[PDB]
Curated annotation (Swiss-Prot), chains A, B:
Interacts with STIM1; the interaction is inhibited by the interaction of STIM1 with EFHB. GO terms for biological process: calcium ion transport; regulation of store-operated calcium entry. Residues 1-132 are lumenal. The chain holds residues 33 to 164 of 339 of the full protein. Negative regulator of store-operated Ca(2+) entry (SOCE) involved in protecting cells from Ca(2+) overfilling. In response to cytosolic Ca(2+) elevation after endoplasmic reticulum Ca(2+) refilling, promotes a slow inactivation of STIM (STIM1 or STIM2)-dependent SOCE activity: possibly act by facilitating the deoligomerization of STIM to efficiently turn off ORAI when the endoplasmic reticulum lumen is filled with the appropriate Ca(2+) levels, and thus preventing the overload of the cell with excessive Ca(2+) ions. Belongs to the SARAF family. GO terms for cellular component: endoplasmic reticulum; endoplasmic reticulum membrane; endoplasmic reticulum-plasma membrane contact site. Its main location: endoplasmic reticulum. It comes from the Eukaryota. This is Store-operated calcium entry-associated regulatory factor. The cytoplasmic C-terminal region mediates interaction with STIM1, while the N-terminal lumenal region mediates regulation of SOCE activity.
């Protein structure tokens, strides 16, 4: 009974990159996960995101999800998803089952940094020697 | 016999971050390894370095070791080390046993970039919802 919450009345979510969701019917997944975007998922990733329920439009709960990101990055699409308690159509969901996936995109500043990221210099060092 | 070379007559070395040295008397180690410096070893690392034997000063062979580095980085001290064939005092060394360790330091540009690396922005996204 308590692990059953009406999704539309859940006020807020705090989702972490190193914690898993709760589940029963489905497999646990990261509470926060990069899934694409113009910058991709292989390098910088936020560790936490804060979501607030902004109301209900007749179809979906409206989530505003924010976090501090390095200046080179922003979110593309973000998607919140929870485990409906009885089924996927249930309006109640399993407590703790919500997660977020995001596309990570470059900002305008990020794309300039990317343009310049390849710059290198030939550096010579006169090495010591160690006998072994 | 062939795996025995006089170190002073070895013309050049090409050392790779993902290959191990040869050894007998000692354990194999990475041909190229970061060991300290003002930037440290946890992030960017060169993958290869090219060393040329620049002569003999009466004590040590003089190695000049160079590679292309990202503009934010340079080498602090670098040290070449090979496995002497019979002992640590042997002037012949085991073929393939040479490696290099380096300190990785920030350049002047690197330190400015580091100064600014922490800059962030609060980014809000209005998330879609996915039923499951």
């Amino acid at each position: 009974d308590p692990d059953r919450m009406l999704l539309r009345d859940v006020k807020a979510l705090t989702l972490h990159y190193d914690r898993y969701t709760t589940s029963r019917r489905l497999d646990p997944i990261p509470q926060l996960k990069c899934v694409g975007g113009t910058a991709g998922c292989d390098s910088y990733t936020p560790k936490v995101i804060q979501c607030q329920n902004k109301g209900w439009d007749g179809y979906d709960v409206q989530w505003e999800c924010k976090t501090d990101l390095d200046i080179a990055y922003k979110f593309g699409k973000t998607v919140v998803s929870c485990e409906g308690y009885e089924s996927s159509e249930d309006q109640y969901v399993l407590r703790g089952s919500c997660g977020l996936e995001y596309n990570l995109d470059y900002t305008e500043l990020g794309l300039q940094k990317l343009k310049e990221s390849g710059k290198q210099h030939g550096f010579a060092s006169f090495s010591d020697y160690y006998y072994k």
